[PDB]
């Protein structure tokens, strides 16, 4: 007959019963994280079992169709994940063993009690705030010697098991199990490749390593005073000074540095007690912010169904910062919302992506995710960047006309911008490149953890290794199989989109003071992109919004001229305190 007719018939049944099954499965999870009960446990188990049951059974039913016999090239876009086989292709013995990994490792991650010591509220605070050489040394070395030892069975048949199924499923490596997305091989011309991502990661890294090298000169020269005989400018950095337990985070620590401490930073809590900030408040003026960008009013049910308050102890729940694409004309943010300077940023962070969600809500269910795997949180990040401009804060209520400013406000804006989000991307470079080389198998089975320095010793210079230890599995974001290449991708696309957006708003020069407001065209053209979602290649759409199929180099400095010139006049391993 015709592939497309019953293909869309099956997919539209999927859409119409997926609103039911999915929507009230996500809604069972909504009742759960709203009200953590046990009938929710059992019914959510059943609903997820029926979701996975559609997956397995109907993805036995879907493979009587071939892969190539398609001409529409959008039916390809739906059939990559529709005609796929999944994880049931192999035997049934390593099935309870993959569950063994994903459950025992998760338990050890959640029951890794040091003896006791409570995991997140106790260890994370003391590890970041203990300030000594012989007490945080205990919590750090005991941590390492307690965690990096028992994982050798789990992890060292873990890698071979995923590599084996990768080869058995006509793939090259556990990465090729993933990277197959980045071969655009449907519509020609807008194609790309997957085989390596060494291109433009070292290349853009060979462009940031100048900027990061100046920043590293500054940082490595700053910490002279604390350890006189252990830290020198000609050597490099010690083991335990990342500002975080792994130091994955590069936008906070202006507090351990005082180049300009004279100018008062922004504070809105005084405004908070002054001007009727209610936690039903700025959210609505955030709505009129998006109106200033050009977006419509927010729906009426959002004030009713979505929770925007403090549920309190009476309402048992957890407020984790991950928005919810509930779908079906319902898109939710379940947060214990408070009025705080960082919560101010968080509100717009979530609402930018929630508006993105209602933006592509007009798309069929299979195409109802972000533009690519990294673009999801990038939507929140770029909107936070857009709304975080201080002179726009002077353009709105939460600031006084008498509030004078100088050019050094942004100096600790950036030297904040060194230790909670972005600045030292090279750590992500280390961890991710080492992770591709270990999961894919190009490293032998006792050469992880030397590399768990010298890549530091080569890229950032964090030193103390021998053969055996296996650190990289003890994270929320690796014990649940999450790859940080999303962070690299967002780190670039954030600023390419930022350059395009601020250039479109007739603001030029350095990009640290662009206000995106009263710009219908910046909203009109954005609509032409956001409405499409994933229907078009990111290369072509990137040229439509920015102007190229590949990431640009100049904009990264176009945002950072002041920090560039300010680094140059303060930036004025094979060395061992060990």
């Amino acid at each position: 007959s015709t592939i497309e007719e019953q293909a869309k018939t099956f997919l539209d049944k999927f859409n119409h019963e997926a609103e039911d099954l999915f929507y009230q499965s996500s809604l069972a999870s909504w009742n759960y994280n709203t009200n953590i009960t046990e009938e929710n446990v059992q019914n959510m188990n059943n609903a997820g079992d029926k979701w996975s049951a559609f997956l397995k059974e109907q993805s036995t039913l879907a493979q009587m169709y071939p892969l190539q016999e398609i001409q529409n090239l959008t039916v390809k876009l739906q059939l990559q994940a529709l005609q796929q086989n999944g994880s049931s292709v192999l035997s049934e013995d390593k099935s309870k063993r993959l569950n063994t990994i994903l459950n025992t490792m998760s338990t050890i991650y959640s029951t890794g009690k040091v003896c006791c010591l409570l995991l997140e509220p106790g260890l994370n605070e003391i590890m970041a705030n203990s300030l000594d050489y012989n007490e945080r040394l205990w919590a750090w070395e005991s941590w390492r010697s307690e965690v990096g030892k028992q994982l050798r069975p789990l992890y060292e048949e873990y890698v071979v098991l995923k590599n084996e199924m990768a080869r058995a499923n006509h793939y090259e490596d556990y990465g090729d199990y993933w990277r197959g997305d980045y071969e655009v091989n449907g519509v020609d011309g807008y194609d790309y490749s997957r085989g390596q991502l060494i291109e433009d990661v070292e290349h853009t890294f060979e462009e940031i390593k100048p900027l990061y090298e100046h920043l590293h000169a500054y940082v490595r020269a700053k910490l002279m005073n604390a350890y006189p005989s252990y830290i020198s400018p000609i050597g490099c950095l010690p083991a335990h000074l990342l500002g975080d337990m792994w130091g994955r985070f590069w936008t906070n620590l202006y507090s351990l540095t005082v180049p300009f401490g004279q100018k008062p930073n922004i504070d809105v809590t005084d405004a908070m007690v002054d001007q009727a900030w209610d936690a039903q408040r700025i959210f609505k003026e955030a709505e009129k912010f998006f109106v200033s960008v050009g977006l419509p009013n927010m729906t009426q049910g959002f004030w009713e169904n979505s929770m925007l308050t403090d549920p309190g102890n009476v309402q048992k729940a957890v407020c984790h910062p991950t928005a919810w694409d509930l779908g079906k004309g319902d898109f939710r943010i379940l947060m214990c919302t408070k009025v705080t300077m960082d919560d101010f940023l968080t509100a717009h962070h979530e609402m930018g992506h929630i508006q993105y969600d209602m933006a592509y809500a007009a798309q069929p269910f299979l195409l109802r995710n972000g533009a690519n795997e990294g673009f999801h949180e990038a939507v929140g990040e770029i909107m936070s960047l857009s709304a975080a401009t201080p002179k726009h804060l002077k353009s709105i209520g939460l600031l006084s006309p008498d509030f004078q400013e100088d050019n050094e406000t942004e100096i600790n804006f950036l030297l904040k911008q060194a230790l909670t989000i972005v600045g030292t991307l090279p750590f992500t470079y280390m961890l991710e490149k080492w992770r591709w080389m270990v999961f894919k198998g190009e490293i032998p089975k006792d050469q992880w953890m030397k590399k768990w320095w010298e890549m530091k010793r080569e890229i950032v210079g964090v030193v103390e290794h021998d053969e055996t230890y296996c650190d990289p599995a003890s994270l929320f974001h690796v014990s649940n199989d999450y790859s940080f290449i999303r962070y690299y991708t967002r780190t670039l696309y954030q600023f390419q989109f930022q350059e395009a957006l601020c250039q479109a708003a007739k603001h030029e020069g350095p990009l640290h003071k662009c206000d995106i407001s009263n710009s219908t065209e910046a909203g009109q053209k954005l609509f032409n992109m956001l409405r499409l979602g994933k229907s078009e290649p990111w290369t072509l759409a990137l040229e439509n919004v920015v102007g190229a199929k590949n990431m640009n180099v100049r904009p990264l400095l176009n945002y950072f001229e002041p920090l560039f010139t300010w680094l140059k006049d303060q930036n004025k391993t094979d060395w061992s305190p060990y």
Partner: protein, 198 residues
Amino acid sequence: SVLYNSASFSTFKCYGVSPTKLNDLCFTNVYADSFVIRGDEVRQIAPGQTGKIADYNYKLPDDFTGCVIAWNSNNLDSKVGGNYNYLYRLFRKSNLKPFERDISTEIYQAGSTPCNGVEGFNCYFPLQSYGFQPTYGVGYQPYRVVVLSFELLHAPATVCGPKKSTNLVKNKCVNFNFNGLTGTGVLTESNKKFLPFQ
């Protein structure tokens, strides 16, 4: 008049035959033509515009005298759990003739393998059901389009618009409109008796 200035039949869209002018012209026959819709069927209900529903659920030549009437019924019938009472054909073979009621209940042959007794591969149902719940989005909220087909058959039209009648004053001549009788003169009380029907 009440439907026009009802302030409740919110999507009273009668583009074409004028509700503003309806109240004098007669039609022989009018038609109650009602079903259930969603917030997406609003634009789908646009005679001239086509789609899944216009091709496989309701019928239309292109043009017909008769309006469309929908209004928010979400509060009326929406239970937590899902309103499975209502349902809809999803995908038919082809279209049908303009404006005929259909309750065809059979199995759709989707692809290559003939159905001829089987319901599995290539043989799925077009009959699906709704799951309406109170949090449903605007594009899905039921509004219930209702149609008002006015056919004026050659026979004289029996149902007509209202007759706006005012008071009568006598002993001073006026123009007058006693149902066809349109002269000009004085009316007065009179004595001569009539029969029950003259």
